[PDB]
Design a protein around this ligand. Structure first.
Ligand SMILES: [Cl-]
Ligand SMILES: [Cl-]
Ligand SMILES: [Cl-]
Ligand SMILES: [Cl-]
Lengths: 206, 209
């Protein structure tokens, strides 16, 4: 509609944005593309990454910037950024811990030495996350926020993608509240659609 | 003093926050500590990182969240996040590119000559991307100081110096059109000058162990 979301459902970062869009009840069309280094794509997305949000003939190309922007131009509940400034800091912190300290490192695994080195980094990252999450029932508290966008998109991937490498050792197993949060989020229409599209794509490609 | 900033002036993430505090004219005390995994520190800074902002016995421990917070509660000029939402997005994009695609890669090095070439092409890629969104007119995102100047001045100044040893005629930053002039302009300002000065004072002292 007024909004186009450029990028396939294979991308954690695309799914992050898609979650916030769906929860806001916004009309949008998802354009299913892969990242590209083609000059013409670099004009709208300088690093050649997805997702890219498009609206009013203009583009935003960082998933964080995108959701902060949607938050600002569509300020109605659910507010991706809480009105309470302390609660907002907690939400941004959770999203940053998940992306920078969990996902980035986990992207070394998606060799033996690395698996080991990576497993320890994730354990540390998970023990830190544990200190700021509430899961009551949402990741930062009792309402949906930007942190649920990052949390459901990134952690559902981490958990699944690493269940074979850490069969009895899964770092995310140390995150109290996660399995139950994951189940709860999947009962909601937005995250269920996000998960469905991802599963379809993964059955297709496999 | 209402605001306490925990972390030493040699950290670019501390300096990123310090630039924003100084530019708004806020009063703060800087508490010099180094990163740490002591259970005492982890209680206020889960990853053991600096900076941590302390106010009213409450702690915020990621530099981006700190500056978004300070800009919300202390909205006096400059607005680190512009009021125009499209301008705000561009400010956030610039800051992300500088931190995630320039500094994180660079930290692989400055913190295998093969690795030196991987990092080199990655940085050149990041710079050409950055070149696309910067304005330097005179600030990095336009005619007023923003969050992107905190990230820009804090990270790029460090990237510039710390990488000349590695890339003598090869420096990625030399590709950023306007950087040298911006860096000179910023140093004419009291806040950025003070950040550079505090960094210099501690470096000189540390060098003599
Ligand atoms: Cl798709
Ligand atoms: Cl991705
Ligand atoms: Cl210091
Ligand atoms: Cl640092």
């Amino acid at each position: 509609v007024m909004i186009k979301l450029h990028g396939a459902s294979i991308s954690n970062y695309v799914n992050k944005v898609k979650l916030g869009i769906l929860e806001k009840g916004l009309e949008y069309e998802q354009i299913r593309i892969a990242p590209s280094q083609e000059e013409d794509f670099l004009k709208i997305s300088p690093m050649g990454k997805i997702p890219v949000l498009e609206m009013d003939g203009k583009f935003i190309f960082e998933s964080g910037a995108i959701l902060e922007f949607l938050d600002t131009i569509f300020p109605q509940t659910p507010k991706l950024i809480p009105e309470d400034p302390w609660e907002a800091a907690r939400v941004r912190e959770i999203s940053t811990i998940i992306e920078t300290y969990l996902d980035i490192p986990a992207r070394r695994i998606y060799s033996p030495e690395i698996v080991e080195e990576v497993h320890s980094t994730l354990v540390k990252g998970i023990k830190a996350l544990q200190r700021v999450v509430r899961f009551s029932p949402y990741i930062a508290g009792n309402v949906f926020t930007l942190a649920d966008c990052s949390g459901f998109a990134h952690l559902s991937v981490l958990d699944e993608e690493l269940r074979p490498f850490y069969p009895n050792n899964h770092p995310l197993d140390l995150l109290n509240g996660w399995k139950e949060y994951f189940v709860f989020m999947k009962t909601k229409a937005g995250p269920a659609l996000v998960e469905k599209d991802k599963q379809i794509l993964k059955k297709i490609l496999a």
